[PDB]
From a paper:
Furthermore, ADO also transduces targeted oxygen-dependent degradation of important regulatory proteins with N-terminal cysteine residues, following removal of genetically encoded N termini. The drug chelates ADO’s metallocofactor and can alkylate one of its ligands.
The HYZyne-ADO adduct isolated from cells has lost the hydrazine moiety of the probe. The most likely mechanisms for the implied C-N fragmentation involve nitrogen-centered radical generation. To capture the anticipated initial state of the HYZ•ADO reaction in vitro, we first purified and crystallized the Fe(II)•ADO complex as previously described. However, attempts to identify conditions that recapitulate covalent coupling to ADO in vitro were unsuccessful, and we posit that a reactant is likely to be present in vivo that is needed to oxidize the drug to initiate its decomposition.
Numbering used by the authors: 4 to 22, 41 to 73, 77 to 144, 146 to 228, 241 to 269
The structure:
């Protein structure tokens, strides 16, 4: 057989996908990465499925760094029971993720964009609970709530591109869950490529209003060591 570990493979293919007979192009490369990810079971990373009140000093979610180049990041997000990763964007990024244990809800949205043929400004009479300050009203943007399914390790991988399902919210459902995440290019808060947060305003794909909000006071994510086979 003589092959590298499945995680070494994924990392190879993510590098090929995001940087003599003709080699793959972007679509075939993205479909193969998707293929490699679907096979990924929790035990291939030596991730024991977790289960089971948390002290205000304990992170609601944790992160295991597997690998990072300028083309992609590769890691695992792990949500303790009841937590959730708030609604955030991925500015100009592709992304793939694969739930390893437990279950999650993902809600996939997008801000309307006149490049896709849709027409984006808020009616001034529009009213929401809670009401909106002046600086807030100037910052709301139209979006679309595309999906809200909940996924388990049986489901396929979840994909995102610069222009679709680029905003999402992950809720740990019925206990703790964890997922492998690929992001390309990786975030860079120093290169003006940050992870921005949003809430949906409250006055079946529907036009919704989104507001950008700071990172929630009680949401943070901490490193924790990675038990699986090492990359390269
Ligand atoms: N990244 N933020 C944070 N970092 N460390 C501890 C924290 C404890 C409570 C709320 C936020 C926290
Ligand atoms: Fe994300």
């Amino acid at each position: 057989d003589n092959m590298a570990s499945l995680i070494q493979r994924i990392a190879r293919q993510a590098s090929l996908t995001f940087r003599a007979p003709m080699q793959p192009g972007f679509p075939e490369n993205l479909s193969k990465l998707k293929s490699l990810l679907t096979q990924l079971r929790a035990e291939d990373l030596n991730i024991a499925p977790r289960k089971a009140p948390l002290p205000p000093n304990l992170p609601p979610v944790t992160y295991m760094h597997i690998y990072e180049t300028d083309g992609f990041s590769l890691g695992v997000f792990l949500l303790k029971s009841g937590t959730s990763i708030p609604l955030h964007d991925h500015p100009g990024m592709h992304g793939m993720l694969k739930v390893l244990y437990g279950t999650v809800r993902i809600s996939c949205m997008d801000k309307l964009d006149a490049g896709g043929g849709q027409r984006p400004a808020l009616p001034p009479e529009q009213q929401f609970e809670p009401p909106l300050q002046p600086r807030e009203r100037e910052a709301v943007r139209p979006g679309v709530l595309r999906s809200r399914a909940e996924y388990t390790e049986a489901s396929g991988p979840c994909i995102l591109t610069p222009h679709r399902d680029n905003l999402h919210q992950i809720d740990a459902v019925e206990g703790p869950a964890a997922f492998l995440d690929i992001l390309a290019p990786p975030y860079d808060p120093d290169d003006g490529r940050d992870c921005h947060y949003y809430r949906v305003l409250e006055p079946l794909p529907r036009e919704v209003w989104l507001l950008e909000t700071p990172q929630a006071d009680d949401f943070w994510c901490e490193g924790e060591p990675y038990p699986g086979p090492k990359v390269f």
